[PDB]
């Protein structure tokens, strides 16, 4: 979540999204194995 | 790492997973790099090696089996060979990997 | 900075020239935060207020990607396209196409041209004409509604393999439960490795359904800023139309958009209000139009372009609610609250551009009106109550409606059909607690439509006949149309035959029900025992 | 249905239609409860 | 009259909560099952 | 309801003699000995049934034409298609590797 402010006092919020949840699941499995 | 670059290519670039798609892209000359797992059969691996030699396409030997390569791609099914048509937002081609 | 010159990727000279000729004097925050990323290997999910440069925000990256991927060259193949754009309504897609054409006006010559094609359901062009001129003209941009673009892509003459850019405008509406069936197929046909741009003013509502589109590398974007007034009136339903009249001939406006629930209601009330204006019930320089989505496409386009072009009132369904922008619209009336509340903000959102003085009004049924206002309040919408006197209803309004219905049986049929359609529309209502079928004023609504008999419905029988105390027989009711008058008289002369056909159908349905022989046996036993007790108790 | 959830065709049809209604309604359920 | 609204609101909220818990459990189970199937053929 | 038995010398329930019951034009139920069914020819590399080749007894092949027991491709009637394709690819790749090894050897003793 990154907020950017312009000259009109209007802010834009930009957040990256993760469509493939498998990356997190494999990462958590590897972390618990570690 | 090397898996991060592959994941970046999957998310942003252009790619083909599987032997048939990789061979088709090599025939069309649309491939920039081919990643080959260590689990691939010797005949198909040798045919891919000969095809890459014919088409002058870079070859990288993945350090793992087909399911490790699939997980690196982010898929829950085994993939034996991957072809990178366009790196996109990643830098796998620049780093010679 | 909001300056075109200091953007990341140095927009093409002809796109810059088109922007300068069109103007905008700068780039909006939406166009500042979306164009750099939608052309930079990132999918885009954009939520922004109406009329904030969103259309150009997804049109400029489309042209940039088309030029970048060498789509405008002789190397590009035939029967292939590059970019697709989808919108839920035909007018919105045509407006997007007009914007793209305006941008391509300044496209330089001496190079392979870039063209667009609009694929909407029309009665002036079959899908095969679309395929023919797609093959002949070879465009790289397709813009259209889900149905006709699905039909177009399903034709074997069109190849989708070279597509690399999909844009969905009003993406919350296209991922709705109704549209998801078509959009799933449309995205199924197209290649998965692509760049997707979803743009909608209520993109947050389609929460987890955005991943159904197939986003790869997405970045959600939220843009936020009394422009307009939001009022409501709580009145008896039978007076509602009269109140509408009392607004049309008294309030000050240049354009008033009046929303109706159904299309048949639009036509029926348009005809009745025209009849009232014939008798000079309302005296003003008002021109009244009707525009619902079941018309032929050419008629819809002609009506919309006549209304857009002096004080005008529009009777429209939810087709015009979302997306399209008619300038100089002052008043918006929602004769009923919408079936879904998410569209409410769109229906009253046609006004307030650049903080213009515009008013929105809504009508309530007096029964469960205590639940709609807090429901909007929880959703951060404040509705200030407005008190409007019901002028001119001293006598004969429902009587006038009734005696106008008695002139032509077609008017009776249209009225009853509209009432039944509204009842079905109310049946499919979200927020069930707020809008209850039991608490619905069936008699009030029937009085609103000028009917004199409640149609046979399960709702009428259960939750609740002749509104006019001296009943009128249908036998002496004349259809007033010569071709159908003889058909009605023939059917009347065949009353017993059709009745017996239905009787035989009913008996055959009885014999085909679950274990019908056993049911007849049980009825025999019950009838024997009951008819025995009916005399044994008395004796 | 492989797990003995439905005992006959009527149960399957009723489950289908009830699932359709509940899918129609959950989206407004939250604000519907918050308002009260 | 209002008892029906309260009753079906509470019932369907309870149904949604149970559905959320059940869907989380089912997703975890199916994910583990397909991972085990992938790693089982060797 | 009429009972039938073997029509030959063997009285035992052996795989050699098996009985079916048929109604003759005389209106009676009678036994009939059934021969052993034929077996589909199998590929000599993978053991799968060969496609396009008739299934007959060993001695019934001598009385049919060659097109009923062969396939027009090389090794047709002996090996299936995928095995032949694998043989071709493997032979070509082996020859190419032999060429490469010979070139490398010619280079490596070219030093002295
Ligand atoms: Zn074989």
Swiss-Prot record, chain B:
InterPro entries with a match to the protein in the record: Ribosomal_eL30-like, Ribosomal_eL30-like_sf, Ribosomal_eL30_CS, Ribosomal_eL8/eL30/eS12/Gad45
Primary localisation category: cytoplasm
Pfam families for this protein: Ribosomal_L7Ae (PF01248)
Database matches in SUPFAM superfamilies: L30e-like
Assigned keywords, A-Z: Cytoplasm, Isopeptide bond, Ribonucleoprotein, Ribosomal protein, Ubl conjugation
Cross-link Glycyl lysine isopeptide (Lys-Gly) (interchain with G-Cter in ubiquitin) placement: 14, 45, 75
A single GO BP: rRNA processing
GO molecular function annotation: pre-mRNA 5'-splice site binding; RNA binding; structural constituent of ribosome
Top-level lineage group: Eukaryota
Cellular component per GO, a single term: cytosolic large ribosomal subunit
Sequence similarity: Belongs to the eukaryotic ribosomal protein eL30 family.
Function: Component of the ribosome, a large ribonucleoprotein complex responsible for the synthesis of proteins in the cell. The small ribosomal subunit (SSU) binds messenger RNAs (mRNAs) and translates the encoded message by selecting cognate aminoacyl-transfer RNA (tRNA) molecules. The large subunit (LSU) contains the ribosomal catalytic site termed the peptidyl transferase center (PTC), which catalyzes the formation of peptide bonds, thereby polymerizing the amino acids delivered by tRNAs into a polypeptide chain.
Further comment: Present with 59300 molecules/cell in log phase SD medium.
The protein's name in its UniProt record: Large ribosomal subunit protein eL30
Organism: Saccharomyces cerevisiae (strain ATCC 204508 / S288c)
Biological classification of the source: Eukaryota, Fungi, Dikarya, Ascomycota, Saccharomycotina
Gene: RPL30
From Swiss-Prot, chain D:
Localization annotation: Cytoplasm
Top-level taxon: Eukaryota
Cross-link (Glycyl lysine isopeptide (Lys-Gly) (interchain with G-Cter in ubiquitin)): 20
Coiled coil: none
Subunit structure: Component of the large ribosomal subunit (LSU). Mature yeast ribosomes consist of a small (40S) and a large (60S) subunit. The 40S small subunit contains 1 molecule of ribosomal RNA (18S rRNA) and 33 different proteins (encoded by 57 genes). The large 60S subunit contains 3 rRNA molecules (25S, 5.8S and 5S rRNA) and 46 different proteins (encoded by 81 genes). eL19 lies in close proximity to the binding site for eukaryotic initiation factor eIF4G.
Leftover remarks: Present with 97700 molecules/cell in log phase SD medium.
Family: Belongs to the eukaryotic ribosomal protein eL19 family.
Function: Component of the ribosome, a large ribonucleoprotein complex responsible for the synthesis of proteins in the cell. The small ribosomal subunit (SSU) binds messenger RNAs (mRNAs) and translates the encoded message by selecting cognate aminoacyl-transfer RNA (tRNA) molecules. The large subunit (LSU) contains the ribosomal catalytic site termed the peptidyl transferase center (PTC), which catalyzes the formation of peptide bonds, thereby polymerizing the amino acids delivered by tRNAs into a polypeptide chain.
Name the UniProt record assigns to this protein: Large ribosomal subunit protein eL19A
From Swiss-Prot, chain F:
Keyword Ribonucleoprotein: yes
InterPro entries: Ribosomal_eL34, Ribosomal_eL34_C_sf, Ribosomal_eL34_CS
GO CC annotations, alphabetized: cytosol; cytosolic large ribosomal subunit; preribosome, large subunit precursor
Gene Ontology MF terms in the entry: structural constituent of ribosome
Top-level lineage group: Eukaryota
Residues in coiled coil: none
UniProt function note: Component of the ribosome, a large ribonucleoprotein complex responsible for the synthesis of proteins in the cell. The small ribosomal subunit (SSU) binds messenger RNAs (mRNAs) and translates the encoded message by selecting cognate aminoacyl-transfer RNA (tRNA) molecules. The large subunit (LSU) contains the ribosomal catalytic site termed the peptidyl transferase center (PTC), which catalyzes the formation of peptide bonds, thereby polymerizing the amino acids delivered by tRNAs into a polypeptide chain.
Entry similarity comment: Belongs to the eukaryotic ribosomal protein eL34 family.
Quaternary structure and interacting proteins, as annotated: Component of the large ribosomal subunit (LSU). Mature yeast ribosomes consist of a small (40S) and a large (60S) subunit. The 40S small subunit contains 1 molecule of ribosomal RNA (18S rRNA) and 33 different proteins (encoded by 57 genes). The large 60S subunit contains 3 rRNA molecules (25S, 5.8S and 5S rRNA) and 46 different proteins (encoded by 81 genes).
Protein name: Large ribosomal subunit protein eL34A
């Amino acid at each position: 979540a990154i907020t950017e402010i312009y000259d009109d006092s209007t802010t834009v919020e930009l957040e990256t999204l993760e469509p493939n949840d498998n990356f997190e699941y494999l990462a958590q499995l590897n972390n618990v194995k570690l | 790492s090397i898996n991060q670059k592959l994941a970046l290519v999957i998310k942003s670039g252009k790619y083909t997973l599987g032997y048939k798609s990789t061979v088709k892209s090599l025939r069309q000359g649309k491939s920039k790099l081919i990643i080959i797992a260590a689990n691939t059969p010797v005949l198909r691996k040798s045919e891919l090696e000969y095809y890459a030699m014919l088409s002058k396409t870079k070859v990288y030997y993945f350090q793992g089996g087909n399911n490790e390569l699939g997980t690196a791609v982010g898929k829950l099914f085994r993939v034996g060979v991957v072809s990178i048509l366009e790196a996109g937002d990643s830098d796998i081609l620049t780093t010679l990997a | 900075s909001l300056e075109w010159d200091n953007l990341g990727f140095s927009l093409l000279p002809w796109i810059r020239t088109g922007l300068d000729v069109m103007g905008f004097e700068t780039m909006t925050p939406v166009q500042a935060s979306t164009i750099p990323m939608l052309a930079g290997n990132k999918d885009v999910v954009v939520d922004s207020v109406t009329g904030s440069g969103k259309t150009a925000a997804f049109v400029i990256p489309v042209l940039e990607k088309v030029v970048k991927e060498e789509a405008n060259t002789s190397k590009f193949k035939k029967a292939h396209f590059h970019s697709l754009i989808i919108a839920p309504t035909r007018e919105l897609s045509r407006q997007i196409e007009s914007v793209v054409l305006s941008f391509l006006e300044h496209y330089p010559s001496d190079l392979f041209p870039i063209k667009c094609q609009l694929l909407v359901g029309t009665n002036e062009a079959t899908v095969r004409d679309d395929v023919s001129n797609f093959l002949r003209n070879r465009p790289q941009i397709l813009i259209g509604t889900p149905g006709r673009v699905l039909d177009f892509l399903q034709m074997p003459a069109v190849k989708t393999s070279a597509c690399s850019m999909v844009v969905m405008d009003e993406a919350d509406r296209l991922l709705d439960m109704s549209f998801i069936k078509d959009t799933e197929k449309i995205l199924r046909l197209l290649p998965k490795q692509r760049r997707t741009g979803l743009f909608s003013a209520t993109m947050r509502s389609a929460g987890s359904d955005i991943f159904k589109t197939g986003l790869r590398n997405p970045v959600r974007i939220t843009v936020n800023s009394s422009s307009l007034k939001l009022n409501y009136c709580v009145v008896n339903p039978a007076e509602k139309l009269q109140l509408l009249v009392s607004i049309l001939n008294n309030y000050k406006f240049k354009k008033c958009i009046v929303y109706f629930p159904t299309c048949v209601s639009v036509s029926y009330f348009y005809s009745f209000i025209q009849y009232l204006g014939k008798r000079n019930i309302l005296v003003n320089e008002v021109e009244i139009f009707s525009l619902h989505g079941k018309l032929q496409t050419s008629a819809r386009t002609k009506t919309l372009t006549a209304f857009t072009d002096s004080n005008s009132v529009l009777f429209t369904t939810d087709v015009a609610a979302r997306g399209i922008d008619i300038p100089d619209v002052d008043l918006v009336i929602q004769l009923d609250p919408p079936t879904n509340t998410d569209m409410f903000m769109h229906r009253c959102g046609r006004t307030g551009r650049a903080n213009r003085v515009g008013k929105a009004i809504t009508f309530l049924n007096e029964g469960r009106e205590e639940d709609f206002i807090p429901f909007m309040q929880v959703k951060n919408v404040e509705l200030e109550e407005l008190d409007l006197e019901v002028k001119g209803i001293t006598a004969n309004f429902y009587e006038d409606f009734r005696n106008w219905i008695l002139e032509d049986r077609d008017r009776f049929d249209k009225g009853v059909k509209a009432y039944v359609a509204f009842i079905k529309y109310y049946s499919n209502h979200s927020a069930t607690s707020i809008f209850r079928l039991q608490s619905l004023d069936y008699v009030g609504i029937a009085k609103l439509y000028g009917l004199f008999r409640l149609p046979r419905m399960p709702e009428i029988t259960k939750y609740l006949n002749w509104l006019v105390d001296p009943p009128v027989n249908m036998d002496e009711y004349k259809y007033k149309d010569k071709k159908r008058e003889k058909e009605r008289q023939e059917t009347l002369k065949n009353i017993s035959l059709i009745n017996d056909k239905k009787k035989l159908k009913s008996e055959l349905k009885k014999k085909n029900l679950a274990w019908s022989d056993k049911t007849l046996t049980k009825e025999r036993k019950l009838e024997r025992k009951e008819k025995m007790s009916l005399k044994r108790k008395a004796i | 249905s492989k797990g003995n959830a439905f005992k006959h065709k009527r149960a399957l049809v009723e489950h289908i239609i009830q699932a359709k209604a509940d899918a129609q309604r959950e989206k407004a359920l939250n604000e519907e409860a918050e308002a009260r | 009259e209002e008892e029906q609204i309260e009753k079906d609101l509470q019932g369907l909220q309870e149904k949604q909560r149970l559905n959320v818990k059940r869907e989380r459990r089912r997703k975890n189970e199916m994910k583990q099952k397909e991972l085990q199937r992938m790693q089982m053929n060797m | 309801a009429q009972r039938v038995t073997f029509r030959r010398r063997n009285p035992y329930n052996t795989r050699s003699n098996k009985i079916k019951v048929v109604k003759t034009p005389g209106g009676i139920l009678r036994a009939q000995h059934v021969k052993k069914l034929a077996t589909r020819p199998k590929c000599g590399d993978c053991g799968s049934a060969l496609q396009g080749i008739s299934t007959l007894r060993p001695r019934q092949y001598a009385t049919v034409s060659k097109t009923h027991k062969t396939v027009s491709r090389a090794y047709g009637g002996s090996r299936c298609a995928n095995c032949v394709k694998e043989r071709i690819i493997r032979a070509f790749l082996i020859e190419e590797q032999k060429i490469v090894k010979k070139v490398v050897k010619e280079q490596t003793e070219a030093a002295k």
